[PDB]
Subunit: 292 residues, 4 copies
């Protein structure tokens, strides 16, 4: 199974193009810093504003740079089943260790619809699928029973990236699906409590800016050392909330730009985080020890 701090990579842009060098450097630093894995082209990587070819470039750059040192789980979802499949076919042919498929957004399929969506994607897949359940953005939910049915009927579906904010979920999924079900969290601020519930790791936003600390936090939870994990939460909380002041990845890109690791370029409809929030992010990093 996948575990620990798995970074949901921000996608650096420069001159309206993918910043190849900044991305390679981001991935390398991410690995030498301790990340257990990478997720290129997720929501944090601004997948919605990426072109088909850019998405492919980012997945491939990430796969070639990681060079098998850590798992690479390519974001390959869509609210169109046929397109999710095209993305999944590219990911696996590119050497990806797995894919992250979000629940169809906007068109609000029924549970049977969501079921058939993943069954079709599972069929065209040859790698691990992690179901990305985030009702807050997709405007639809994946019921525990539906999730359980998908896990049971789709050999490639191995787990979930839970972003419901409902902590009964990891426990209810441990019941519906066994202990062999891969439980990953999609939200940093509550990863502490998610791990206590039997979670395996977190596809992280904060790890983009504080990779080493997030790695230690995760490793601390994996070692069952929740006291250390708490102290780490104490150090990382200001950043966890500051990174979400407005809409992610606006804060993560400001943070990484403030660190001189990329330009802070965001693509419309997203815009640069508000200035007062930029200060809060600064003090948040100073508090974590990231910013001098």
């Amino acid at each position: 199974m996948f575990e620990g701090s798995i970074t949901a990579l921000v996608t650096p842009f420069a001159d309206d193009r993918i910043d190849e060098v900044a991305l390679h450097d981001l991935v390398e630093w991410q690995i030498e810093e301790g990340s257990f894995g990478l997720v290129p082209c997720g929501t944090t990587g601004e997948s919605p504003t990426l072109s088909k070819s850019e998405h492919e470039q980012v997945v491939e750059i990430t796969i070639k740079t990681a060079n098998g040192r850590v798992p690479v789980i390519a974001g390959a979802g869509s609210n169109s089943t046929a397109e999710a499949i095209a993305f999944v076919r590219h990911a696996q042919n590119a050497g990806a260790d797995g894919v992250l498929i979000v629940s169809p957004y906007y068109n609000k399929p029924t549970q049977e619809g969501i079921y058939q969506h993943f069954k079709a994607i599972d069929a065209a897949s040859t790698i691990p699928i992690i179901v990305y359940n985030i009702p807050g953005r997709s405007a639809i939910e994946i019921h525990v029973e539906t999730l359980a049915r998908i896990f049971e009927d789709c050999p490639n579906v191995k787990g979930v990236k839970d972003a419901t904010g409902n902590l009964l979920r990891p426990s209810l999924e441990r019941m519906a699906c066994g202990e062999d079900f891969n439980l990953l969290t999609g939200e940093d601020g509550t990863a502490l409590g998610y791990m206590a519930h039997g979670g395996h790791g977190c596809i992280s936003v904060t790890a983009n800016v504080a990779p080493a600390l997030c790695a230690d936090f995760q490793q601390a939870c994996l070692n069952g050392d929740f006291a250390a994990a708490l102290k780490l939460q104490d150090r990382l909380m200001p950043l966890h909330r500051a990174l979400f002041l407005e809409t992610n990845p606006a804060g993560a890109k400001y943070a990484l730009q403030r660190l001189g690791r990329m330009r802070g370029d965001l693509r419309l409809p997203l815009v640069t985080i508000s200035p007062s929030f930029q200060e809060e992010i600064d003090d948040a990093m100073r508090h974590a020890g990231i910013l001098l």
Copy 2:
């Protein structure tokens, strides 16, 4: 100014391709039945599962078939501002009378980002822009001030397709945006109250199956004859209700298939409406006198 019953056309499929003959006969029948305008490739037209080439063919076939008889407002939204500009450019170049731009879905942009979204689109447009405010699918809202500011700074933005279900909106918008603001409803079952609050029409789902009755309903509303509009509500409510028993357009396609105007084919993640719901739709059409 757009008004009356503007049909949000369902996109007929056959053998995994656009059913062009069915699409043509739908637009035609729709026009001879009295519809005030057509909206090809909206959410009811399953735009999310349409290839970019299919999107274009559907818009063009509708425009060519309409032959200037009724306005054609092309769906051209996207959660990528760059992509939205591409749909708008194509549409206006194809002869569309305007465009339906939904608020960016899933990526949850701030209010300033939404404002910049529409300002960037307005700069690339040469045709009327209607803002599709539907929080329940986009997982984001467009505050009245934001909407008023967009109307003020964007010369091509002429109105809204309100799908909030909050009837204070048209009143609040009449205040913030003058009476020259084009008010259209996105929901059939509450169009009656919307028109009473000063609405100008409705971009309809029900108009797909009962074009004649809906057009009359709107005409009553427009003539201020709300007594007749209510009588029509009594006749259409069962259908308005049944068409939404599961996620739209599953219900409308079942109905048009039952009426023999196309195949009920839907694309994943969407699935055919449940059988007990098919019966309710049958009874609603019989009640509306659409079926014998």
Copy 3:
């Protein structure tokens, strides 16, 4: 049948006691201004902070002052069925024309529990019962079937005070519950659309400050003259909007205090409306011609 502008009376306080002189003059002025009916001790009458003895005095003073000129529908709800029966018994024994029973709040009963709630109250009643469906405060809903079932099995249940903000409701209720079902709105800003969908009136908050204009609005609606009703909306919307800038009845009490009809005294946990909002209310009253 209840109809028109039924004022949900604010409860005037002075020196931590009911201001009886102010209450009497409010009911009187309200009646000579044209209000169709009065609802003492509703949520706008701060029933939650009223002692049981104060509740009774307010109901009785309103009834005595009304002197049979307009119907008096007494607030008698509670999240305790036993307590609701006590309020209803007192009310009818005091000469109330009916009772306003809110859905049980906070304790979130199932639909069967709500049904039994109203069935137990209907058995103790001898006067008309109106069901106050307001999900936003009660944190619970009354499905249409449940509401229809209550209407069917409870001879004293005559209608609803809809405060869902879902305009499909009156239409769906017209279907499930015949046209003999008394439809009243709980929200002023959407009364216009409610009446167009077949509503019979509105249990108003705005009618407290502009009894004359609201009564006219309702009369227009009732006469099917929606053109005039819209014109009145234009005149009342600013006020409908300002009266709800913060939690009601904070806005209405500020307005009636500014008009010199009572003290602005509110009981904790409720506090006086913010100063910038007081100004917006002032401007709204000036716009509605209520203030010079």
Copy 4:
């Protein structure tokens, strides 16, 4: 500070009266089983359907039976500030170790309102106050800053009973309020993750039926032994969800009645849990080892 498994006592009824003997026995068994504390007259104890005198009897019976062996935190909230104070004055004069004050429900006070509510209650209090934040029932929220302001300005306010379902809360409160802030959870199913976040205990529903296991679970979390806690969660999850199948305390009373510890009598508008759910609760207890 308060910690561990603090039971939110169900209130046994018999012949429409408080079942004095069943309650005494419940409290004794609760103590000999390992409970770290008792909360008489909370939501689980059906405070909404209790009379002023019954509430007082239950608090006093609980205080006399506990006989100082464990803390007794009397539920003393209301959406009326004056009444919360009356309840708090009785609790402390009765020998209570603290009180549980819910955020005002139904009347939706503003944050300043909620602030003044607790400031007034704090003033009339001489014992610890735990703020019960449960937006799901109260239909209002207590912002972190508001909570922090209340903690800082009210010497008697020592902590919170968090029932938001938002795990960022314990971490954000650890930041706003220090480590001296008493963090108690209001929801059993996510207590595991709450403790990982620095939680001190849980005012429990499940502890009513499985007091010893909930005690061990809590003690396990207090000892920082999250591996054991997980195994305990594994054993207790079926009961945690089964106890909330319908509306609490309907399942808790069925469970305790199934154990022969009281009659399952519930007060309207609440009703007995559905039969199929009674079976699920049975198997849930058999799974936990409670039921033979």
